[PDB]
Design a protein around this ligand. Structure first.
Ligand SMILES: C=C(C)[C@@H]1CC[C@]2(C)C/C(F)=C(/C)CC/C=C(/C)CC[C@H]12
Ligand SMILES: C=C(C)[C@@H]1CC[C@]2(C)C/C(F)=C(/C)CC/C=C(/C)CC[C@H]12
Ligand SMILES: [Cl-]
Ligand SMILES: [Cl-]
Ligand SMILES: [Cl-]
Ligand SMILES: [K+]
Ligand SMILES: [K+]
Ligand SMILES: [Mg+2]
Ligand SMILES: [Mg+2]
Ligand SMILES: [Mg+2]
Ligand SMILES: [Mg+2]
Ligand SMILES: [Mg+2]
Ligand SMILES: [Mg+2]
Ligand SMILES: [Mg+2]
Ligand SMILES: [Mg+2]
Ligand SMILES: [Mg+2]
Lengths: 300, 294
């Protein structure tokens, strides 16, 4: 009793959109992101921290799956500006364990067991004041992801318009959290302020989200997840899809041009985040098959 | 030509109100602070800005405080100490907003904010309120002709409203106001800033319309009506209708939140309109209560 297969996939458009994304970055960012190459002992300080954090929750996560989560941090920070490798490791761990939370059936969502682990992490890696800002944002993200599961507010914000949708994603895609745990990496006063006002997150939300949405569309509709801007257009209609996609390209371009008004080091961090997320997204098994050993729901 | 939106004052006021009556319906209710409450607030404001060395009159404090009196959600208030705190913090950062930036001494003012926050709030909420107040005044200061403010207020309504989530003080407002209500959902939306992101356009479009003449006279660029041609009534009308449509869109989406939270959001937007149209600050450009503080 067939449903709407023609709306089930953006796979027809995969090559052309990938090409167009890359052309856009080449014309407006130019500088290619840089990957951090951790060592193995060093990677096992991150991963055993990740396993320790989610271990109380009772679900095993493979090293392969951790790898899929951690790549976004390796590719989308600004390695040239790092001064707190402890803060960098915190962001690797915090990113990864909240990625697990994102992928979990909400039955496993135990704040009483998981929150204490998040405080544990922020304390090993951050000075006591930055540990406070990182913990607040991690708490706020995991609480948001959880209460908004099948939520009326999410329904309305994901159906009305792109600008309502992106307003939801400032928090839900995790970028506000990202900024508020990453500023200790850089010890840059201006970026720290843009991080704490959330202006940093507001400038980078669309560039992160549009890319994530395109490449996670197939998995998300097969699972009934509504948080994806391409559900706002008719992806079965090539003409309509193209107009929508160009509108989203225009969004990214305008944000990138305004990020250029920020000071030199802040804009490097912002642009490495957006462009690094795109390199990571296109290179990661997470977004290559619909359902896999690193991206299928962790069900309970 | 582009100097003024005076010609459209009556029509735009009419249209704002019609929009609220059809979409919000329920009218703001003013808080009637008692005397002991009101005198405490003003004395507190004067103590806070005294280290900056400038006089603020009672009628200037009253004009600032009216937004809190009109734009909270009285029938849901639980903690009047938190309400008094929002009165004081709102007012003293309004003074900061009106201060030409040589006066901004963080080492003298930040301790004042900290002590206000600790007096009226518990230990956890005092930290959230203080960080939000600190972020606001720092942002107002660091963006006085910054290039970032340049790009974000010139490019599109998009970048502009993104700047105003912080710069119009609404993120700060939410983070100091959630203790008033003790409503866990509202507290989450406040701390994620989703509450601020939902209410920014409604507050800003109204504020920008009625503060345009003052801001343009005094070389101030943070105003969405500067994005469009107020020379041409037809272009102004198109732009003003696009802004009304934005407000409507936000209000209709706000009616997805839980009943109480949506009450607070909508009383904030509608109450700001009522206060703005009754406040001398938002008539003319130079007067008793909106003059730069120098
Ligand atoms: C805590 C991390 C950082 C959180 C974890 C879940 C998140 C919502 C997953 C998804 F949205 C990722 C790949 C997009 C990458 C963007 C970063 C800024 C934020 C990404 C999110
Ligand atoms: C925030 C909202 C409700 C309203 C609406 C815009 C406002 C009129 C402008 C301005 F004064 C702000 C930045 C400075 C003081 C901050 C807030 C708390 C209150 C101040 C005002
Ligand atoms: Cl610290
Ligand atoms: Cl925000
Ligand atoms: Cl408290
Ligand atoms: K666009
Ligand atoms: K519009
Ligand atoms: Mg998610
Ligand atoms: Mg997800
Ligand atoms: Mg996705
Ligand atoms: Mg169809
Ligand atoms: Mg201002
Ligand atoms: Mg002002
Ligand atoms: Mg206290
Ligand atoms: Mg104004
Ligand atoms: Mg007067």
């Amino acid at each position: 009793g067939a449903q709407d297969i023609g709306r089930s996939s953006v796979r027809p458009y995969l090559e052309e959109c990938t090409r167009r994304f890359q052309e856009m970055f080449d014309r407006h960012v130019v500088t290619r992101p840089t990957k951090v190459e951790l060592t193995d002992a060093e990677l096992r300080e991150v991963i055993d921290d990740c396993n320790a954090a989610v271990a109380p929750l009772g679900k095993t996560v493979s090293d392969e799956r951790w790898i899929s989560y951690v790549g976004v941090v390796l590719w989308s920070q600004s390695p040239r500006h790092i001064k707190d490798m402890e803060a960098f490791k915190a962001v690797c761990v915090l990113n990864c364990v909240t990625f697990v939370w994102d992928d979990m059936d909400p039955a496993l969502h135990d704040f009483g067991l998981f929150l204490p682990q998040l405080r544990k992490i922020c304390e090993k890696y951050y000075g006591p004041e930055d540990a406070e800002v990182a913990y607040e944002a991690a708490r706020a993200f995991v609480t948001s992801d959880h209460m908004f599961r099948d939520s009326p507010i999410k329904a309305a914000l994901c159906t009305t318009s792109p600008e309502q949708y992106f307003r939801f994603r400032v928090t839900d895609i995790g970028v506000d959290f990202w900024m508020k745990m990453s500023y200790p990496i850089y010890r840059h006063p201006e970026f720290t302020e843009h991080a704490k006002t959330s202006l940093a997150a507001r400038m980078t939300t669309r560039g992160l989200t549009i890319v994530n949405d395109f490449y996670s569309y197939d998995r998300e509709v097969s699972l009934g997840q509504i948080t994806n801007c391409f559900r706002l257009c008719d992806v079965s209609d090539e003409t309509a899809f193209k107009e929508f996609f160009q509108a989203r390209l225009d969004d990214m371009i305008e944000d990138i041009e305004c990020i250029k008004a920020f000071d030199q080091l802040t804009q490097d961090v912002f642009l490495d985040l957006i462009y690094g997320n795109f390199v990571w997204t296109t290179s990661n098994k997470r977004y290559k098959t619909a359902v896999n050993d690193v991206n299928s729901r962790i069900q309970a």
